[PDB]
Amino acid sequence: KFISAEEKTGVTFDDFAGQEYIKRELQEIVRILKNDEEFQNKGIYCPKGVL
Amino acid sequence: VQIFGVHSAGKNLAEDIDFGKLVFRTVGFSGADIRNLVNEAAIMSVRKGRSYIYQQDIVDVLDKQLLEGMGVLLTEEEQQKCEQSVSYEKKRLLAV
Protein backbone atom coordinates (compact mmCIF):
# COMPACT_ATOMS: atom_id res chain seq x y z
CA LYS A 1 0.00 0.00 0.00
CA PHE A 2 2.83 2.36 -0.94
CA ILE A 3 2.31 3.10 -4.67
CA SER A 4 1.41 6.77 -5.13
CA ALA A 5 -1.61 6.80 -7.45
CA GLU A 6 -1.19 10.50 -8.15
CA GLU A 7 -3.18 12.72 -10.51
CA LYS A 8 -1.34 16.05 -10.16
CA THR A 9 2.21 16.90 -9.09
CA GLY A 10 2.64 20.57 -10.00
CA VAL A 11 5.56 20.25 -12.46
CA THR A 12 4.89 21.23 -16.08
CA PHE A 13 6.81 20.90 -19.34
CA ASP A 14 8.00 24.52 -19.14
CA ASP A 15 10.18 23.77 -16.09
CA PHE A 16 12.36 21.34 -18.10
CA ALA A 17 14.04 22.73 -21.22
CA GLY A 18 17.13 22.10 -23.32
CA GLN A 19 15.77 18.84 -24.81
CA GLU A 20 12.90 20.14 -26.95
CA TYR A 21 13.20 17.13 -29.26
CA ILE A 22 12.59 14.85 -26.27
CA LYS A 23 9.70 17.08 -25.16
CA ARG A 24 8.15 16.85 -28.63
CA GLU A 25 8.59 13.06 -28.75
CA LEU A 26 7.04 12.62 -25.30
CA GLN A 27 4.22 14.97 -26.33
CA GLU A 28 3.57 12.75 -29.35
CA ILE A 29 3.58 9.64 -27.14
CA VAL A 30 1.14 11.04 -24.57
CA ARG A 31 -1.05 12.51 -27.34
CA ILE A 32 -1.20 9.10 -29.03
CA LEU A 33 -2.19 7.55 -25.69
CA LYS A 34 -4.92 10.11 -24.90
CA ASN A 35 -6.23 10.39 -28.49
CA ASP A 36 -5.94 6.66 -29.23
CA GLU A 37 -8.96 6.08 -31.48
CA GLU A 38 -8.18 8.99 -33.85
CA PHE A 39 -4.72 7.61 -34.66
CA GLN A 40 -5.73 3.93 -34.55
CA ASN A 41 -8.07 4.94 -37.37
CA LYS A 42 -4.77 5.28 -39.27
CA GLY A 43 -3.35 2.16 -37.59
CA ILE A 44 -0.99 4.09 -35.28
CA TYR A 45 -0.03 2.25 -32.08
CA CYS A 46 1.86 3.65 -29.11
CA PRO A 47 5.01 2.12 -27.62
CA LYS A 48 4.26 0.25 -24.41
CA GLY A 49 7.54 0.76 -22.56
CA VAL A 50 9.59 3.96 -22.78
CA LEU A 51 13.05 3.79 -21.21
CA VAL B 1 9.36 -5.96 -49.81
CA GLN B 2 6.64 -8.55 -49.20
CA ILE B 3 6.76 -7.96 -45.42
CA PHE B 4 6.56 -4.20 -46.03
CA GLY B 5 3.47 -4.80 -48.17
CA VAL B 6 1.92 -7.16 -45.59
CA HIS B 7 2.41 -4.96 -42.52
CA SER B 8 1.33 -1.77 -44.35
CA ALA B 9 -1.75 -3.13 -46.13
CA GLY B 10 -4.19 -1.51 -43.70
CA LYS B 11 -2.73 1.97 -44.15
CA ASN B 12 -3.34 4.77 -46.66
CA LEU B 13 -0.28 4.75 -48.91
CA ALA B 14 0.43 7.34 -51.59
CA GLU B 15 1.29 6.68 -55.24
CA ASP B 16 4.99 7.57 -55.08
CA ILE B 17 5.76 5.11 -52.25
CA ASP B 18 7.98 2.26 -53.45
CA PHE B 19 10.14 0.18 -51.11
CA GLY B 20 12.25 -1.25 -53.95
CA LYS B 21 14.47 1.84 -53.97
CA LEU B 22 15.10 1.64 -50.20
CA VAL B 23 16.01 -2.06 -49.88
CA PHE B 24 19.69 -1.11 -49.57
CA ARG B 25 18.85 1.09 -46.56
CA THR B 26 17.14 -1.75 -44.64
CA VAL B 27 19.85 -4.42 -44.53
CA GLY B 28 19.55 -6.59 -41.43
CA PHE B 29 16.03 -5.40 -40.57
CA SER B 30 13.63 -7.96 -39.12
CA GLY B 31 9.83 -8.00 -39.48
CA ALA B 32 9.43 -6.16 -36.18
CA ASP B 33 11.88 -3.53 -37.45
CA ILE B 34 9.92 -3.06 -40.69
CA ARG B 35 6.67 -2.81 -38.70
CA ASN B 36 8.31 -0.19 -36.48
CA LEU B 37 9.52 1.64 -39.60
CA VAL B 38 5.98 1.75 -41.04
CA ASN B 39 4.59 2.97 -37.70
CA GLU B 40 7.40 5.56 -37.53
CA ALA B 41 6.52 6.82 -41.02
CA ALA B 42 2.85 7.01 -40.02
CA ILE B 43 3.67 8.98 -36.86
CA MET B 44 5.83 11.54 -38.68
CA SER B 45 3.14 11.62 -41.37
CA VAL B 46 0.46 12.65 -38.88
CA ARG B 47 2.89 14.92 -37.02
CA LYS B 48 3.42 17.12 -40.09
CA GLY B 49 -0.34 17.18 -40.80
CA ARG B 50 0.03 14.95 -43.84
CA SER B 51 -2.90 12.83 -44.96
CA TYR B 52 -0.81 10.12 -46.68
CA ILE B 53 2.70 8.69 -46.34
CA TYR B 54 5.00 9.29 -49.31
CA GLN B 55 8.51 7.94 -49.80
CA GLN B 56 9.98 11.07 -48.19
CA ASP B 57 8.40 10.13 -44.84
CA ILE B 58 10.28 6.81 -44.86
CA VAL B 59 13.46 8.58 -46.01
CA ASP B 60 13.14 11.12 -43.18
CA VAL B 61 12.45 8.37 -40.63
CA LEU B 62 15.54 6.41 -41.69
CA ASP B 63 17.67 9.56 -41.79
CA LYS B 64 16.53 10.72 -38.34
CA GLN B 65 17.21 7.26 -36.90
CA LEU B 66 20.69 7.36 -38.47
CA LEU B 67 21.28 10.84 -37.01
CA GLU B 68 20.11 9.66 -33.58
CA GLY B 69 22.40 6.61 -33.85
CA MET B 70 25.50 8.70 -33.13
CA GLY B 71 23.70 10.76 -30.48
CA VAL B 72 22.53 13.92 -32.27
CA LEU B 73 19.08 15.11 -31.14
CA LEU B 74 18.55 18.51 -32.76
CA THR B 75 15.46 20.16 -34.19
CA GLU B 76 15.63 22.22 -37.39
CA GLU B 77 16.15 25.67 -35.82
CA GLU B 78 19.05 24.69 -33.60
CA GLN B 79 20.67 22.75 -36.45
CA GLN B 80 20.40 25.83 -38.68
CA LYS B 81 21.89 28.23 -36.11
CA CYS B 82 24.74 25.80 -35.33
CA GLU B 83 25.43 25.50 -39.07
CA GLN B 84 25.50 29.31 -39.26
CA SER B 85 27.84 29.46 -36.23
CA VAL B 86 30.67 27.70 -38.06
CA SER B 87 32.82 29.90 -40.30
CA TYR B 88 33.16 29.58 -44.09
CA GLU B 89 36.74 28.41 -44.77
CA LYS B 90 36.71 25.66 -42.14
CA LYS B 91 33.45 24.49 -43.71
CA ARG B 92 35.11 24.83 -47.14
CA LEU B 93 37.73 22.27 -46.08
CA LEU B 94 35.04 19.79 -45.01
CA ALA B 95 33.31 20.48 -48.33
CA VAL B 96 36.39 19.48 -50.35
Side-chain angles (χ1 to χ4, degrees), chain B residues 30-46:
Chain B
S30 88
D33 302 30
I34 304 203
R35 156 183 193 171
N36 205 338
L37 162 74
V38 179
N39 163 52
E40 268 273 354
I43 290 185
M44 326 316 159
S45 75
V46 72

PDB file of all heavy atoms in Angstrom, chain B residues 30-46:
ATOM      1  N   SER B  30      14.543  -6.850 -39.326  1.00  0.00           N
ATOM      2  CA  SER B  30      13.626  -7.961 -39.117  1.00  0.00           C
ATOM      3  C   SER B  30      12.200  -7.479 -39.394  1.00  0.00           C
ATOM      4  O   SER B  30      11.985  -6.312 -39.729  1.00  0.00           O
ATOM      5  CB  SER B  30      13.802  -8.520 -37.702  1.00  0.00           C
ATOM      6  OG  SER B  30      12.968  -7.841 -36.779  1.00  0.00           O
ATOM      7  N   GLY B  31      11.215  -8.365 -39.258  1.00  0.00           N
ATOM      8  CA  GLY B  31       9.828  -8.001 -39.475  1.00  0.00           C
ATOM      9  C   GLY B  31       9.323  -6.993 -38.463  1.00  0.00           C
ATOM     10  O   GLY B  31       8.549  -6.090 -38.800  1.00  0.00           O
ATOM     11  N   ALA B  32       9.768  -7.143 -37.213  1.00  0.00           N
ATOM     12  CA  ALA B  32       9.434  -6.163 -36.184  1.00  0.00           C
ATOM     13  C   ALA B  32      10.032  -4.801 -36.510  1.00  0.00           C
ATOM     14  O   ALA B  32       9.390  -3.766 -36.295  1.00  0.00           O
ATOM     15  CB  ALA B  32       9.915  -6.650 -34.817  1.00  0.00           C
ATOM     16  N   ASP B  33      11.257  -4.782 -37.040  1.00  0.00           N
ATOM     17  CA  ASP B  33      11.880  -3.526 -37.446  1.00  0.00           C
ATOM     18  C   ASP B  33      11.145  -2.866 -38.607  1.00  0.00           C
ATOM     19  O   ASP B  33      10.993  -1.641 -38.614  1.00  0.00           O
ATOM     20  CB  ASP B  33      13.346  -3.758 -37.813  1.00  0.00           C
ATOM     21  CG  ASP B  33      14.146  -4.352 -36.669  1.00  0.00           C
ATOM     22  OD1 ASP B  33      13.556  -5.082 -35.845  1.00  0.00           O
ATOM     23  OD2 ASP B  33      15.364  -4.086 -36.591  1.00  0.00           O
ATOM     24  N   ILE B  34      10.674  -3.646 -39.584  1.00  0.00           N
ATOM     25  CA  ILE B  34       9.916  -3.065 -40.691  1.00  0.00           C
ATOM     26  C   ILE B  34       8.565  -2.548 -40.205  1.00  0.00           C
ATOM     27  O   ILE B  34       8.097  -1.489 -40.645  1.00  0.00           O
ATOM     28  CB  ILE B  34       9.765  -4.088 -41.833  1.00  0.00           C
ATOM     29  CG1 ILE B  34      11.145  -4.576 -42.292  1.00  0.00           C
ATOM     30  CG2 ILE B  34       8.975  -3.488 -42.995  1.00  0.00           C
ATOM     31  CD1 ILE B  34      11.187  -5.132 -43.707  1.00  0.00           C
ATOM     32  N   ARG B  35       7.920  -3.275 -39.287  1.00  0.00           N
ATOM     33  CA  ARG B  35       6.667  -2.805 -38.701  1.00  0.00           C
ATOM     34  C   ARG B  35       6.876  -1.496 -37.943  1.00  0.00           C
ATOM     35  O   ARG B  35       6.076  -0.557 -38.052  1.00  0.00           O
ATOM     36  CB  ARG B  35       6.092  -3.884 -37.779  1.00  0.00           C
ATOM     37  CG  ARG B  35       5.155  -3.360 -36.698  1.00  0.00           C
ATOM     38  CD  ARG B  35       4.687  -4.475 -35.777  1.00  0.00           C
ATOM     39  NE  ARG B  35       3.577  -4.052 -34.932  1.00  0.00           N
ATOM     40  CZ  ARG B  35       2.862  -4.865 -34.167  1.00  0.00           C
ATOM     41  NH1 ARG B  35       3.114  -6.164 -34.113  1.00  0.00           N
ATOM     42  NH2 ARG B  35       1.870  -4.365 -33.436  1.00  0.00           N
ATOM     43  N   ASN B  36       7.971  -1.419 -37.181  1.00  0.00           N
ATOM     44  CA  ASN B  36       8.315  -0.189 -36.477  1.00  0.00           C
ATOM     45  C   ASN B  36       8.608   0.941 -37.453  1.00  0.00           C
ATOM     46  O   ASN B  36       8.270   2.095 -37.189  1.00  0.00           O
ATOM     47  CB  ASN B  36       9.516  -0.429 -35.559  1.00  0.00           C
ATOM     48  CG  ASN B  36       9.566   0.541 -34.392  1.00  0.00           C
ATOM     49  OD1 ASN B  36       8.981   1.624 -34.440  1.00  0.00           O
ATOM     50  ND2 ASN B  36      10.271   0.157 -33.335  1.00  0.00           N
ATOM     51  N   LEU B  37       9.238   0.625 -38.586  1.00  0.00           N
ATOM     52  CA  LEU B  37       9.519   1.640 -39.601  1.00  0.00           C
ATOM     53  C   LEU B  37       8.230   2.191 -40.203  1.00  0.00           C
ATOM     54  O   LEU B  37       8.097   3.403 -40.412  1.00  0.00           O
ATOM     55  CB  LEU B  37      10.415   1.048 -40.689  1.00  0.00           C
ATOM     56  CG  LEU B  37      10.483   1.782 -42.028  1.00  0.00           C
ATOM     57  CD1 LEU B  37      11.314   3.049 -41.902  1.00  0.00           C
ATOM     58  CD2 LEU B  37      11.044   0.872 -43.109  1.00  0.00           C
ATOM     59  N   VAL B  38       7.269   1.310 -40.490  1.00  0.00           N
ATOM     60  CA  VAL B  38       5.985   1.754 -41.036  1.00  0.00           C
ATOM     61  C   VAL B  38       5.236   2.608 -40.016  1.00  0.00           C
ATOM     62  O   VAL B  38       4.660   3.651 -40.355  1.00  0.00           O
ATOM     63  CB  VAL B  38       5.146   0.548 -41.496  1.00  0.00           C
ATOM     64  CG1 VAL B  38       3.804   1.011 -42.036  1.00  0.00           C
ATOM     65  CG2 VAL B  38       5.883  -0.227 -42.573  1.00  0.00           C
ATOM     66  N   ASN B  39       5.241   2.183 -38.748  1.00  0.00           N
ATOM     67  CA  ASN B  39       4.586   2.968 -37.704  1.00  0.00           C
ATOM     68  C   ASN B  39       5.278   4.315 -37.510  1.00  0.00           C
ATOM     69  O   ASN B  39       4.618   5.337 -37.293  1.00  0.00           O
ATOM     70  CB  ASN B  39       4.557   2.173 -36.396  1.00  0.00           C
ATOM     71  CG  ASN B  39       4.287   3.045 -35.186  1.00  0.00           C
ATOM     72  OD1 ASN B  39       3.321   3.808 -35.157  1.00  0.00           O
ATOM     73  ND2 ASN B  39       5.143   2.935 -34.175  1.00  0.00           N
ATOM     74  N   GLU B  40       6.611   4.331 -37.602  1.00  0.00           N
ATOM     75  CA  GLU B  40       7.396   5.559 -37.532  1.00  0.00           C
ATOM     76  C   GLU B  40       7.024   6.517 -38.657  1.00  0.00           C
ATOM     77  O   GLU B  40       6.835   7.721 -38.426  1.00  0.00           O
ATOM     78  CB  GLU B  40       8.879   5.184 -37.605  1.00  0.00           C
ATOM     79  CG  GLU B  40       9.579   4.958 -36.268  1.00  0.00           C
ATOM     80  CD  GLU B  40      10.125   6.231 -35.662  1.00  0.00           C
ATOM     81  OE1 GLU B  40      10.068   7.273 -36.339  1.00  0.00           O
ATOM     82  OE2 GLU B  40      10.608   6.189 -34.511  1.00  0.00           O
ATOM     83  N   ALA B  41       6.908   5.993 -39.880  1.00  0.00           N
ATOM     84  CA  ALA B  41       6.519   6.818 -41.018  1.00  0.00           C
ATOM     85  C   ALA B  41       5.105   7.354 -40.847  1.00  0.00           C
ATOM     86  O   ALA B  41       4.828   8.505 -41.193  1.00  0.00           O
ATOM     87  CB  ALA B  41       6.643   6.019 -42.314  1.00  0.00           C
ATOM     88  N   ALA B  42       4.202   6.541 -40.291  1.00  0.00           N
ATOM     89  CA  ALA B  42       2.846   7.015 -40.023  1.00  0.00           C
ATOM     90  C   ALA B  42       2.836   8.122 -38.970  1.00  0.00           C
ATOM     91  O   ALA B  42       2.073   9.092 -39.085  1.00  0.00           O
ATOM     92  CB  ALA B  42       1.960   5.850 -39.583  1.00  0.00           C
ATOM     93  N   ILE B  43       3.675   7.998 -37.939  1.00  0.00           N
ATOM     94  CA  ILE B  43       3.671   8.981 -36.856  1.00  0.00           C
ATOM     95  C   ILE B  43       4.224  10.316 -37.346  1.00  0.00           C
ATOM     96  O   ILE B  43       3.664  11.380 -37.057  1.00  0.00           O
ATOM     97  CB  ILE B  43       4.451   8.452 -35.638  1.00  0.00           C
ATOM     98  CG1 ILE B  43       3.685   7.312 -34.971  1.00  0.00           C
ATOM     99  CG2 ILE B  43       4.620   9.553 -34.604  1.00  0.00           C
ATOM    100  CD1 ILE B  43       4.317   6.808 -33.686  1.00  0.00           C
ATOM    101  N   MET B  44       5.327  10.287 -38.103  1.00  0.00           N
ATOM    102  CA  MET B  44       5.828  11.536 -38.685  1.00  0.00           C
ATOM    103  C   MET B  44       5.010  11.988 -39.890  1.00  0.00           C
ATOM    104  O   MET B  44       5.192  13.107 -40.383  1.00  0.00           O
ATOM    105  CB  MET B  44       7.313  11.426 -39.040  1.00  0.00           C
ATOM    106  CG  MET B  44       8.117  10.558 -38.101  1.00  0.00           C
ATOM    107  SD  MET B  44       7.621  10.978 -36.417  1.00  0.00           S
ATOM    108  CE  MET B  44       8.112   9.536 -35.493  1.00  0.00           C
ATOM    109  N   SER B  45       4.113  11.139 -40.394  1.00  0.00           N
ATOM    110  CA  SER B  45       3.141  11.618 -41.370  1.00  0.00           C
ATOM    111  C   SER B  45       2.047  12.429 -40.691  1.00  0.00           C
ATOM    112  O   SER B  45       1.649  13.490 -41.186  1.00  0.00           O
ATOM    113  CB  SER B  45       2.536  10.444 -42.137  1.00  0.00           C
ATOM    114  OG  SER B  45       1.606   9.737 -41.336  1.00  0.00           O
ATOM    115  N   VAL B  46       1.554  11.950 -39.547  1.00  0.00           N
ATOM    116  CA  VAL B  46       0.460  12.648 -38.876  1.00  0.00           C
ATOM    117  C   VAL B  46       0.996  13.832 -38.075  1.00  0.00           C
ATOM    118  O   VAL B  46       0.261  14.778 -37.766  1.00  0.00           O
ATOM    119  CB  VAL B  46      -0.346  11.670 -37.996  1.00  0.00           C
ATOM    120  CG1 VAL B  46       0.446  11.250 -36.765  1.00  0.00           C
ATOM    121  CG2 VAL B  46      -1.698  12.264 -37.623  1.00  0.00           C
TER     122      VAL B  46
END
